[PDB]
């Protein structure tokens, strides 16, 4: 494509939403606060505005990255693939742990789409490049690849990952988790990757840690000199309660 793209266009009211959610985040998290929300939006708009939405690079986002620097405890990181709801619910109940989307930068961009045009200097609300059909180097795809690499690269000690046990590929080598995150876990820093395979909750009494795609993930991590551990969440409807109440006798019966 050239000016007409295959993907949804910039989220309606994008500029207001970014600034709005930047203020809510910087009030609620004073350890930052030094941050100027008008300044971060300038750095974010600057990354893609008046640029060709198929020629965007990591460097375009460096301004934004510097303004959004945040050290998250490296030992409290949760990665996730396809099971977005339970991942974020988990960090809402276990409030010392973080997903990418609980950081300032991840929080700004979550569920939003954005792109510009080669010169019009306007935001394109009509359409934006689709990763598959249009081009991989688009404002949205390049943003998530850059923040996701940094997030995984910082992780230390025990890193957790939540996977969707109801997908045909529980571990997907072509996901951001499979492509970027797993190859940026440093064995000098990381002792263990521990996977949680969330069952669809109906009937899947199978040990999904023996799934061939989990065996593939295990081999990748093992070759990085990191310990791979894997457990099943058979009852997602009881998971949050059991994490907070590990001495409840209805939780321990799962051994």
């Amino acid at each position, epitope marked *: 494509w050239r000016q007409t793209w295959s993907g949804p266009g910039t989220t309606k009211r994008f500029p207001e939403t970014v600034l709005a959610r930047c203020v809510k985040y910087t009030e609620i998290h004073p350890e930052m606060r030094h941050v100027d929300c008008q300044s971060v939006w300038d750095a974010f708009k600057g990354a893609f505005i008046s640029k060709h939405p198929c020629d965007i690079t990591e460097e375009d986002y460096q301004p934004l990255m510097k303004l959004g620097t945040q050290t998250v405890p490296c030992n409290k990181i949760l990665l996730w693939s396809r099971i977005k709801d339970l991942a974020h619910q988990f960090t809402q109940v*276990q409030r010392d*742990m973080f997903t990418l989307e609980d950081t300032l930068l991840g929080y700004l961009a979550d569920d939003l789409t954005w792109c510009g045009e080669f010169a019009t200097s306007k935001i394109n609300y009509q359409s934006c490049p689709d990763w598959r059909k249009d081009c991989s180097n688009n404002p949205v795809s390049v943003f998530w690849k850059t923040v996701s690499r940094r997030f995984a690269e910082a992780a230390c000690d*025990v890193v*957790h990952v939540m996977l969707d046990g109801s997908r045909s590929k529980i571990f997907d080598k072509d996901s951001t988790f499979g492509s970027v995150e797993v190859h940026n876990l440093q064995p000098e820093k990381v*002792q*263990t990757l*521990e996977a*949680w395979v969330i069952h669809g909750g109906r009937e899947d009494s199978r*040990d999904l*840690c023996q799934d061939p795609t989990i065996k593939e993930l295990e081999s990748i991590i093992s070759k990085r000199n990191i*310990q791979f*551990s*894997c*457990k*099943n*969440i*058979y009852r997602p409807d009881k*998971f949050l309660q*059991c*994490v907070k109440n*590990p*001495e409840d*006798s209805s*939780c*321990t*019966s*799962e*051994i």
Partner: nanobody
Amino acid sequence: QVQLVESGGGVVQPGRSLRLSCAASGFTFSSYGMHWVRQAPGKEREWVAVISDDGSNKYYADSVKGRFTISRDNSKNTLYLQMNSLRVEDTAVYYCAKDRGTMRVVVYDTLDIWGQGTLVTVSS
């Protein structure tokens, strides 16, 4: 040669203390959560306690809380259970078991490896 070997079981009177040991070999003990599970002769298994790989998490069944302490020595690859104020109802074969993961976040799944257990008898 993944192995767990429990020691310390015997016959004690109510009110006394007993320390159990569980010697681990054949795997990186210091990277796994560890459990104690007990089974009174003729009765169903009862989960007793869990300790995370780093010892930061220690959790206990309501039936032993305040009387039993779980601990580990990652240099000796040994798990312990310190039992105090023992009761007749504490009589059981005590097993140590290896978690699939770390239990820094307590997530309960099937335990992969079990010891042979050590019988503890509390009888006047």
